[PDB]
Write a protein that binds this ligand. Structure first.
Ligand SMILES: CCCCCCCCCCCCCCCCCC(=O)OC[C@H](COP(=O)([O-])OCC(O)COP(=O)([O-])OC[C@@H](COC(=O)CCCCCCCCCCCCCCCCC)OC(=O)CCCCCCCCCCCCCCCCC)OC(=O)CCCCCCCCCCCCCCCCC
Ligand SMILES: CCCCCCCCCCCCCCCCCC(=O)OC[C@H](COP(=O)([O-])OCC(O)COP(=O)([O-])OC[C@@H](COC(=O)CCCCCCCCCCCCCCCCC)OC(=O)CCCCCCCCCCCCCCCCC)OC(=O)CCCCCCCCCCCCCCCCC
Ligand SMILES: CCCCCCCCCCCCCCCCCC(=O)OC[C@H](COP(=O)([O-])OCC(O)COP(=O)([O-])OC[C@@H](COC(=O)CCCCCCCCCCCCCCCCC)OC(=O)CCCCCCCCCCCCCCCCC)OC(=O)CCCCCCCCCCCCCCCCC
Ligand SMILES: CCCCCCCCCCCCCCCCC[C@@H](O)O[C@H](CO[C@H](O)CCCCCCCCCCCCCCC)COP(=O)(O)OCC[N+](C)(C)C
Ligand SMILES: CCCCCCCC/C=C\CCCCCCCC(=O)OC[C@H](COP(=O)(O)OCCN)OC(=O)CCCCCCC/C=C\CCCCCCCC
Ligand code: HEM
Ligand code: HEM
Lengths: 446, 419, 51, 106, 54, 49, 54, 57, 54
C-alpha cells in the first residue's frame, strides 16, 4: 500500500549542472507532455539605488516588446503561434522570466529566452509608450488596498534600507529614466553565475543542457569592470505608518515583526506557528467558534472580516506577521485577540495544536507543488535562495523534528517583547497608539 | 505508468481511480445535480446546499467534521456549476479512512437541522456579493437568464428575495430527488483502486437509481440591461450552438480560438487576435474583446464578450461582430487555423496538466457516458476538424437568432435586435 | 471541574509552574522585607539593620 | 430491577408533582427550569409554535403571581398531561457541550 | 425553616449562662447549622432533581 | 500613488548604535531595551522604598 | 426627548430609579433591600447629631 | 469535454466553507490591464483575492 | 474581546482612566486638576490618623 515511507521517495530529483560561463541549468523529468522553461534571475528591486529605481520593472514591461533578432510583434506572433504562454514577473529580490509550452515545442522556446536575455531591443519610442503605460498602470493599481498596505509595511520596516523602496518605483522618478540607464542596468546586473536556467515536466536534462550551451553561453561571466554587489545585514526599524481616508468602507491593516532570514532553520518552526494562527474569511461557512483560535476569534461577536498570517522572508531579514480587514469600531478588538494568540504561542503551546500545525504545513508544502509551473518556480526560486534543491523528504524530515517546546523557544525568540513594524490604511482611528501595541507585545502574568 | 481504471457498479454508481505516487491523495465525488434542476418552486436551493457541507449530520456532529478535517490537515471543498455538482476532498495518503467517511456522511445522510440552516441564511448575500465583485460574472449569469426560457436560465447564486426563505425541507426534497446513486460518480487518484472498491461499496447501500431528471432548457432571444454609472460598460451577445460531442462543437472551439479566446502574453497587446486587432484600430486602446462558448448537454452558446468605454461601446461590438461576418464570407487562411488548433491542443493540455483540474475533467466526462477519453484522442478529434466546418459554425452564428446582456452606462450600446 | 483533568492541561500546568516559582519567590521575599522579619533576614550576608 | 415497583416510583413522583406548586399556576415542568447558557441555547432552537406557547404560559404565571391567585382547579396542569418539549433540545445542547469539552481536553 | 429555627436556637443559647444543658444544645445547633448548609441541602436538591425526572 | 510615499529620515532622533543601515539590530536590541528596563527597574526600587 | 434623558446627571436617576425594568410579580421581601439604604440614611444623619455632643 | 477547462466559458464556482471559489475559465481577465483602466470594484465587503493555495516561505 | 469591555467595574475604569480620549497637546497646567484629586486622599488619610488622638 502507498505510504510516506515510499511515496515521498518517488518524486524525481532535479539534475543540476554548470555551464562554463557559470550559468546553472536544472531540470526535472516528470513524464509530462508539457514543460515550462524559465530564467530566474537573482536581480531584484533592492539592488537599485534611488537614481534608477524603475529600471528592472520597466524592463519587464518592455521585455517582450522587441528584440534585436526581430520586432516584438514577430516575437509575440511566434509565441502565440506555438500556443505558448510566455510570462514574467519581478520581486524586491527575485526577477523571473518563463515560457509555457509543449515539450515537442521545447527547443524553439529556449533560444528565445536567450534572445530575451542577451539582447532586448530598446526603441526610444517604445520606451516613450511604455512610460505612459506605467503612469496609467500606477493609478490602475491605486484601486488596490492590500498592496498599498504591504508597501507601507516595507517602507515602515526598513525605511533607509535599499530593500524598502517599491518595485514599481516612484511616480516622479519613472519619467526621468533614459535608455542608457537601462542598458547600464543590463550590463551591470544581467550575467551568470547570477543567471539560473531551470525546467520541469517533459524535459530531458541533457537535451536542455546541450541546447542551453548554444544560446545561454553567450552571456558574459567575468564581471564587467569587475563590479561586485555589496549586500548588508540590513536594520529593522520599529516604526509605523498610518494613512487615513475615512470615507473608505473598511480599515485595512498589517502588523509585522523581524524574521529569520531566507536561509535559516527557524523559519520552518515559524511556519508551524503560522499554521496555528490560521486564516479566515466571513465568506467561509466554517466560522462561528470553529477552526483556528484567531479564526475562531474572527467570529463570536463577529470581529475580523478577513485576514491571513504571513512570513515574507528575505536573504538578509524577513517579516513575520498578520494582515487583516476591519470594521471601524472593531479595530481594537481584532488586535487584542491577535497579539494574544502570539502570546499564547510564546507560552502555553499544547503538543496537539503543534501537531495540527505540522499537518497543515505538510499539506500546504506538498499541495503547492502540483503542476509544472510551481515546481519550475520552486527550482528557480530555490536555487537562488539556497543553492541545491530541498527534496520534500528533507522538509518532512525536518518538520518531524519540530516540537511544541521548539515552537515556544523560537516564537519567544522572534516575537515576544519585540518592537513591531506597523502599517494601517484607513479609516483607522480606533487602532491603538504604538505604545498600546508595544505594551500588547508582552504579558505581565508571565 | 497506468491508465485510469474506469468501472461501473450494479447500484449504477460509477467509479474510477488513477494511481500516482504524489503523497496528497485527492478524491472527488460528482453528482449530476445542479442549479438547472431547480425550478421556480425551490430556486436557489443549490447555492445554500453547497454551503451546507460543514453542517452536522446523522453520523457526525459539525464540530467533528470541521475539527476532524482540520486536525488531519486535509480539506473538503465544494465545486458547483449549472450542470454537475462536485464535492471534493484532499488529504495525506494515510488519513483517507477518516476524511472519506465524512464524505460518505455529507452526501448520503445530511440531516438539516433548521436553526443551523437559518444561521447560514444571511451568509448567502455575502457570498453572492463577493462573487459579484468579479465584473464578468454579473453579466454572464444575466446572460443565461436572457438566453433560456427554462432550465439553464436558473442562476448559480440565490435570488435576493430567497435569501431568508430557503428551508430545510426544500433541502431534503432536493437531496433525495437528485443525489441518486445512478447520477453519482467517484474519482480517486493517489488512492489505490481496491480500497475504493471497499469504500464505494459502502456508498452502494444508500439510495435507489434514477433521479427526477426534468426540464430541457429551451432557447430564447431576450435582452437584459442594467444601466449603471460605471464608465466601463461591458456586455456579451450570443447565438445558439450545437453541443456536445459533435464535430460542430469542436468547430466552435477552434472558432473561438481563431478569434483569440484569451491572451498568451502577459502585459502585451494581442497582435494575432482578429477581434483585438479590429477594435484597436476601431477606437481607443482601453478595451478587452474575446469569444465566449458555453457548452451544456442540452445546448451550447457562442458569442463575443467585451469590456469598453461607455461612449465607444457601439463602436466596439459592431466591429468585432463584423469580424465574425468576415468568416461567414469564407475569408479564412489555413495557417491561422493551424495556429488556433495548436492553441486548443496546448491550452487543453495545460488545463489538464494540473491534477485538480484533471480530476475536474475526469469527473466532468464520467457522467456523460463515463468512457474516459485520453487527451491524444481529443487531439485526434480536433485534428479531424476542417476549415469548412469552421465556416459553417460562423455561418450558424451569423444566421442565428441572438441574445444579449449588458452592464454599464449603456448610453451608447446597441440593442440586441440592431446589434 | 472534571473537565479540567486532561493531558494538555498537564502539559499546560507544567508550562506555567516555573512562573509560579518566580511569583512565589517574589511574594515570599517581598513579605519578609516589608515586615523586616528578624528570623529570616538575619541569615542574609549583609542585611543587618536590626540589632 | 424496576417493574411493578416502578408503578410505585410513580406514586411518589405524582405526589411530588402535586407538592411542587407550579402546575397550580399552569406552568409545565419545562417552563420552570433555570436558564443557564445551555438552556438559553436550547430555547433558541424551539419551533416557533412551541416557543410562543411557552411565553404565554410564563406570562400568565407571573401575572397570576402579583394577584396572588391560583389558577382554577379544572385548569391546573395534569401530571400525565405534560409535554416534555425542551428535553430533546437541552440534551442536544448539553451533548454538544460535552463533546466540545471532551475534544478540548485532548 | 429548620435552619432558621436553628438560628433562633443559636440566639437563645447565646442569651444564656454556661451550663451543660445549654452547651449540649449549642454543640448540636452548631454542627446542625453547618451540616444543613453543606451536606443536607445539595443531596435533597439531587433527590428533587430525580423526583421530576431530570 | 501607492509607491510614491517614502519615510522621511529619522536619523536625527535615532539611537547612536543603530544609526547605520548595515549592522543587524538583533544584537543591539537587548542593549537598547535593557537600558530602559534598567531605568524603570531602578525607579520601581525607589518608589518601593 | 424628555429633559431627563438629555441631562448626564438625570440619566443616572433615570436608569437607576425612574425607568429600570423590574419583575411584575415582586413581593414584600424585595422592599427590604431598599429599606436598608434608608436605614443607612437614618443611621448616618441621626448618628451625626450624636457626634456633635459625644 | 464539457468541462470549463476543455472548453473555456462560464465560471464554475468552488465556493465552500474551507476554500474560496476562485477558478473558472475565460471570461476575459488580466488582459484588460494593458488597455487603460480596469479599475475593479472596491470593498463591497470584499474578500482578499488570489487565495493563497500557492504558499511560500 | 478584552475583559475591560465586559465587567462593569472594568468598564467604568476603562472609561474614566484607561481609554478615554484626551487632547494630545495638553500641558502641565491641567495636571494640577488631577493633583487636587490626589491631595484630597492625603487630606483624608493623614487627617484620619489625627482624629484618633484629637
Ligand atoms: C502574584 C500573582 C501575579 C499574577 C496574577 C495572575 C492572574 C491571572 C491573569 O489572568 O492575569 C491578569 C493580569 C495579567 O496581566 P497581562 O499579562 O498584561 O494580561 C492582561 C490582558 O493582556 C489585558 O490586556 P490590556 O491591553 O487590556 O491591558 C490593559 C493594561 C491595564 O492598564 C493599567 O494598568 C491601568 C493603570 C493606569 C490607570 C490609573 C490612572 C490614574 C489617574 O494592562 C494590564 O492589564 C495591567 C493589569 C494590572 C492590574 C490587573 C487588574 C486586576 C485588578 O494580571 C496582572 O497584571 C499580573 C501582574 C502582577 C503584577 C505584580 C504583582 C506583585 C504583587
Ligand atoms: C420583627 C419581624 C419583622 C416584621 C414581620 C415580618 C416581615 C413581614 C413581611 O415583610 O412580609 C409581608 C408579607 C406580605 O405578603 P406578600 O407580599 O404576598 O409576601 C409574599 C408571601 O409570602 C406569599 O406567600 P403566601 O401567599 O403563601 O402567603 C404567606 C403567608 C400568608 O399571609 C399573607 O399572604 C399576607 C398576610 C398579611 C395580612 C394582613 C392582616 C392584617 C394586618 O403565610 C403566613 O403568614 C403564615 C401563617 C401564620 C400567620 C398568620 C397571620 C398573618 C396575618 O406577609 C407575609 O408573607 C408574612 C406575614 C406573617 C407575619 C407573621 C405572623 C405570625 C406568624
Ligand atoms: C506659584 C508658582 C508655580 C510655578 C509653576 C509650577 C508648574 C509649571 C508647569 O506647568 O510645569 C512646568 C512647565 C513645563 O512647560 P510646559 O509643559 O510646556 O507648560 C506650558 C507652557 O507654559 C507653554 O508656554 P510657553 O511654551 O510659551 O513657555 C512658558 C515658559 C517657558 O518655560 C518652559 O519652557 C518650561 C520650563 C523650562 C525652564 C526652566 C528654568 C530652570 C528651572 O515661559 C516662562 O518661563 C514664564 C515667563 C516668566 C518666568 C521666566 C523664568 C522662569 C523659568 O513649565 C512652565 O509652565 C513654566 C514655569 C514657570 C516658573 C515660574 C516663574 C515665576 C513666575
Ligand atoms: C504556601 C503557599 C502555596 C502557594 C505558592 C505561591 C503561589 C504564588 C501565586 C500563584 C500564582 C499562579 C501563577 C500562574 C499564572 C497563570 C494564570 C493563567 O494564565 O494560567 C492559566 C491556567 O493556569 C493553570 O490553571 C494553573 C497553573 C499554575 C498552577 C500551579 C499550582 C501548584 C500548587 C501545588 C501545591 C503546592 C502548595 C500547596 C499548599 C497548600 C493558563 O493561561 P491561558 O492563557 O488561559 O492558557 C492558554 C489558553 N487556554 C486555556 C485556552 C488553553
Ligand atoms: C507593610 C510594608 C509596606 C508595603 C509597601 C509595598 C510597596 C511596593 C511598591 C511597588 C511599586 C510598583 C508599582 C507597579 C504598578 C503596576 O503594576 O503597573 C502596571 C502597568 C502596566 O502597563 P503596561 O506597560 O501598558 O502593561 C501592558 C502589558 N500588556 O504599568 C504602569 O502602571 C506604569 C504607569 C503607572 C500607572 C499607575 C496607576 C495605578 C492605579 C491602578 C488602578 C488600576 C486598576 C484597575 C482595576 C480596578 C478594579 C476595581
Ligand atoms: C450602618 C451604620 C451605623 C450603625 C449600624 C451604627 C450603630 C451604632 C450603635 C449600635 C451605637 C451604640 C449606641 C448605644 O448602644 O447606645 C452607635 C453609637 C454612635 N454612633 Fe453609630 N452607627 C452607624 C453609623 C454612624 C455614623 C454614620 C455616625 C456619624 C456620622 C455615627 C455616630 C455615632 C455616635 C457619635 C455614637 C455614640 C452615641 C451613643 O453611643 O449613644 N454612627 N452607633
Ligand atoms: C480637602 C480636605 C481637607 C483639607 C484641605 C484639610 C485641611 C486642614 C487644615 C488647614 C487643618 C488645620 C491644621 C493646622 O493648621 O494645624 C486641618 C486639621 C485637621 N484635619 Fe483636615 N483637612 C481636610 C480633610 C480632613 C479629613 C478627611 C480628615 C479626617 C479625619 C481631617 C482631619 C483633621 C483633624 C482631626 C485636624 C485637627 C488635628 C490637628 O490639627 O492636629 N481633615 N485640616
Amino acid at each position: 500500500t502507498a505510504t510516506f515511507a515510499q511515496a515521498l521517495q518517488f518524486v524525481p530529483e532535479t539534475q543540476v549542472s554548470l555551464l562554463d560561463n557559470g550559468l546553472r541549468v536544472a531540470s526535472e523529468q516528470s513524464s509530462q507532455p508539457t514543460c515550462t522553461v524559465g530564467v530566474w534571475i537573482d536581480v531584484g528591486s533592492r539592488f537599485e539605488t534611488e537614481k534608477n529605481n524603475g529600471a528592472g520593472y520597466f524592463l519587464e514591461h518592455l521585455a517582450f516588446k522587441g528584440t534585436k533578432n526581430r520586432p516584438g510583434s514577430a516575437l509575440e506572433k511566434e509565441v502565440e503561434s506555438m500556443g505558448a504562454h510566455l510570462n514574467a514577473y519581478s520581486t524586491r529580490e527575485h526577477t523571473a522570466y518563463y515560457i509555457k509550452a509543449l515539450s515537442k515545442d521545447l527547443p524553439k522556446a529556449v533560444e528565445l529566452l536567450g534572445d530575451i536575455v542577451q539582447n532586448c531591443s530598446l526603441e526610444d519610442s517604445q520606451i516613450e509608450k511604455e512610460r505612459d503605460v506605467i503612469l496609467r498602470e500606477m493609478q490602475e493599481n491605486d484601486a488596490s488596498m492590500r498592496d498599498v498596505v504591504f508597501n507601507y509595511l516595507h517602507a515602515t520596516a526598513f525605511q533607509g534600507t535599499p530593500l524598502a523602496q517599491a518595485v514599481e518605483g516612484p511616480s516622479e522618478n519613472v519619467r526621468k529614466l533614459s535608455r542608457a540607464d537601462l542598458t547600464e542596468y543590463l550590463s551591470t546586473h544581467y550575467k551568470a553565475p547570477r543567471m539560473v536556467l531551470a525546467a520541469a515536466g517533459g524535459v530531458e536534462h541533457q537535451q536542455l543542457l546541450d541546447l542551453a550551451q548554444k544560446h545561454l553561453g553567450g552571456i558574459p561571466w567575468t564581471y564587467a569592470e569587475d563590479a561586485v554587489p555589496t549586500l548588508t545585514p540590513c536594520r529593522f526599524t520599529g516604526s509605523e505608518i498610518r494613512h487615513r481616508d475615512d470615507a473608505l468602507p473598511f480599515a485595512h491593516v498589517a502588523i509585522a515583526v523581524e524574521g529569520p532570514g531566507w536561509a535559516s532553520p527557524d523559519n520552518v518552526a515559524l511556519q508551524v506557528a503560522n499554521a496555528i494562527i490560521g486564516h479566515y474569511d466571513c465568506t467561509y461557512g466554517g466560522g462561528v467558534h470553529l477552526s483556528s483560535p484567531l479564526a475562531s476569534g474572527a467570529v463570536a461577536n463577529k470581529l475580523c472580516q478577513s485576514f491571513q498570517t504571513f512570513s515574507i522572508c528575505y536573504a538578509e531579514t524577513g517579516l513575520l506577521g498578520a494582515h487583516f480587514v476591519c470594521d471601524r469600531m472593531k479595530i481594537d478588538d481584532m488586535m487584542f485577540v491577535l497579539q494574544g494568540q502570539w502570546m499564547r504561542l510564546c507560552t502555553s503551546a499544547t503538543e496537539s495544536e503543534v501537531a495540527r500545525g505540522k499537518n497543515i504545513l505538510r499539506n500546504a508544502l506538498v499541495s503547492h507543488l502540483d503542476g509544472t509551473t510551481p515546481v519550475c518556480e520552486d527550482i528557480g526560486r530555490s536555487l537562488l535562495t539556497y543553492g541545491r534543491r530541498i527534496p520534500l523528504a528533507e522538509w518532512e524530515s525536518r518538520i518531524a523534528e519540530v516540537d511544541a517546546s521548539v515552537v515556544r523557544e523560537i516564537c519567544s525568540k522572534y516575537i515576544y517583547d519585540q518592537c513591531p513594524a506597523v502599517a494601517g490604511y484607513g479609516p483607522i482611528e480606533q487602532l491603538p497608539d504604538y505604545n498600546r501595541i508595544r505594551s500588547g507585545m508582552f504579558w505581565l502574568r508571565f | 505508468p497506468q491508465d485510469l481504471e474506469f468501472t461501473k457498479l450494479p447500484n449504477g454508481l460509477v467509479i474510477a481511480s488513477l494511481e500516482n505516487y504524489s503523497p496528497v491523495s485527492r478524491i472527488g465525488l460528482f453528482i449530476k445535480a445542479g442549479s438547472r434542476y431547480e425550478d421556480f418552486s425551490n430556486l436557489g436551493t443549490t447555492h445554500l446546499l453547497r454551503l451546507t457541507s460543514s453542517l452536522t449530520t446523522k453520523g457526525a456532529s459539525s464540530f467533528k467534521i470541521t475539527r476532524g478535517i482540520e486536525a488531519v490537515g486535509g480539506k473538503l471543498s465544494v465545486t458547483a456549476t449549472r450542470e454537475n455538482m462536485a464535492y471534493t476532498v484532499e488529504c495525506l495518503r494515510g488519513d483517507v479512512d477518516i476524511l472519506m467517511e465524512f464524505l460518505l456522511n455529507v452526501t448520503t445522510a445530511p440531516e438539516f437541522r433548521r436553526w443551523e440552516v437559518a444561521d447560514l441564511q444571511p451568509q448567502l448575500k455575502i457570498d453572492k456579493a463577493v462573487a459579484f465583485q468579479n465584473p464578468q460574472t454579473h453579466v454572464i449569469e444575466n446572460l443565461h437568464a436572457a438566453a433560456y426560457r427554462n432550465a439553464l436560465a436558473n442562476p448559480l447564486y440565490c435570488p435576493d428575495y430567497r435569501i431568508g426563505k430557503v428551508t430545510s425541507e426544500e433541502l431534503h426534497y432536493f437531496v433525495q430527488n437528485h443525489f441518486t446513486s445512478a447520477r453519482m460518480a467517484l474519482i480517486g487518484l493517489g488512492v489505490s483502486h481496491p480500497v475504493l472498491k471497499q469504500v464505494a461499496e459502502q456508498f452502494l447501500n444508500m439510495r435507489g437509481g434514477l433521479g427526477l431528471s426534468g426540464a430541457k432548457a429551451n432557447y430564447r432571444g431576450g435582452e437584459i440591461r442594467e444601466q449603471n454609472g460605471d464608465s466601463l460598460v461591458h456586455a456579451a451577445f450570443v447565438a445558439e450552438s450545437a453541443v456536445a460531442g459533435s464535430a460542430e462543437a469542436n468547430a466552435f472551439s477552434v472558432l473561438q480560438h481563431v478569434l483569440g479566446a484569451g491572451p498568451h502574453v502577459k502585459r502585451g497587446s494581442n497582435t494575432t487576435s482578429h477581434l483585438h486587432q479590429a477594435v484597436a484600430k476601431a477606437t481607443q486602446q482601453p478595451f478587452d474583446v474575446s469569444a465566449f462558448n458555453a457548452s451544456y448537454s442540452d445546448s451550447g452558446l457562442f458569442g463575443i464578450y467585451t469590456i469598453s468605454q461607455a461612449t465607444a461601446a457601439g463602436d466596439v461590438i459592431k466591429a468585432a461582430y463584423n469580424q465574425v461576418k468576415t468568416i461567414a464570407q469564407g475569408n479564412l487562411s489555413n495557417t491561422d487555423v493551424q495556429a488556433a488548433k495548436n492553441k486548443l491542443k496546448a491550452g487543453y493540455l495545460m488545463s489538464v496538466e494540473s491534477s485538480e483540474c484533471f480530476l475536474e475533467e475526469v469527473g466532468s466526462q464520467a457522467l456523460v457516458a463515463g468512457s474516459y477519453m485520453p487527451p491524444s484522442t481529443v487531439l485526434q478529434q480536433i485534428d479531424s476538424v476542417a476549415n469548412a466546418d469552421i465556416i459553417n459554425a460562423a455561418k450558424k452564428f451569423v444566421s442565428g437568432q441572438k441574445s444579449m446582456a449588458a452592464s454599464g452606462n449603456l448610453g451608447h450600446t446597441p440593442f440586441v435586435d440592431e446589434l | 471541574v472534571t473537565r479540567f483533568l486532561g493531558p494538555r492541561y498537564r502539559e499546560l500546568v507544567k508550562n506555567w509552574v516555573p512562573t509560579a516559582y518566580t511569583w512565589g519567590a517574589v511574594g515570599a521575599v517581598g513579605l519578609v522585607w516589608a515586615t523586616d522579619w528578624r528570623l529570616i533576614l538575619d541569615w542574609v550576608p549583609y542585611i543587618n539593620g536590626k540589632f | 430491577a424496576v417493574s411493578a415497583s416502578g408503578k410505585w416510583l410513580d406514586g411518589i413522583r405524582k405526589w411530588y408533582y402535586n407538592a411542587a406548586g407550579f402546575n397550580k399556576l399552569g406552568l409545565m415542568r419545562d417552563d420552570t427550569i433555570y436558564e443557564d447558557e445551555d438552556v438559553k441555547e436550547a430555547i433558541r432552537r424551539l419551533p416557533e409554535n412551541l416557543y410562543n406557547d411557552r411565553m404565554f404560559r410564563i406570562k400568565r404565571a407571573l401575572d397570576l403571581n402579583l394577584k396572588h391567585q391560583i389558577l382554577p382547579k379544572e385548569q391546573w396542569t395534569k401530571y400525565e398531561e405534560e409535554n416534555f418539549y425542551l428535553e430533546p433540545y437541552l440534551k442536544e445542547v448539553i451533548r454538544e457541550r460535552k463533546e466540545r469539552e471532551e475534544w478540548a481536553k485532548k | 425553616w429548620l435552619l432558621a429555627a436553628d438560628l433562633l436556637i443559636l440566639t437563645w443559647i447565646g442569651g444564656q449562662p454556661v451550663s451543660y444543658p445549654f452547651t449540649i444544645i449549642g454543640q448540636v445547633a452548631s454542627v446542625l447549622y453547618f451540616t444543613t448548609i453543606l451536606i443536607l441541602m445539595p443531596t435533597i436538591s439531587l433527590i428533587e432533581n430525580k423526583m421530576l425526572k431530570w | 500613488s501607492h509607491t510614491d510615499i517614502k519615510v522621511p529620515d529619522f536619523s536625527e532622533y535615532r539611537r547612536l548604535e543603530v544609526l547605520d543601515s548595515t549592522k543587524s539590530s538583533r544584537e543591539s536590541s537587548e542593549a537598547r531595551k535593557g537600558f530602559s528596563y534598567l531605568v524603570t527597574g531602578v525607579t520601581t526600587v525607589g518608589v518601593a522604598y | 426627548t424628555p429633559m431627563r434623558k438629555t441631562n448626564p446627571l438625570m440619566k443616572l436617576i433615570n436608569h437607576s430609579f425612574i425607568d429600570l425594568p423590574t419583575p411584575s410579580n415582586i413581593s414584600a421581601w424585595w422592599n427590604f433591600g431598599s429599606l436598608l439604604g434608608a436605614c443607612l440614611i437614618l443611621q448616618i444623619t441621626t448618628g451625626l447629631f450624636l457626634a456633635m455632643h459625644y | 469535454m464539457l468541462s470549463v477547462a476543455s472548453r473555456s466559458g462560464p465560471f464554475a464556482p468552488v465556493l465552500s466553507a474551507t476554500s474560496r471559489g476562485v477558478a473558472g475559465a475565460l471570461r476575459p481577465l488580466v488582459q484588460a490591464t494593458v488597455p487603460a483602466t480596469p479599475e475593479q470594484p472596491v470593498l463591497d465587503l470584499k474578500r482578499p483575492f488570489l487565495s493563497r493555495e500557492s504558499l511560500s516561505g
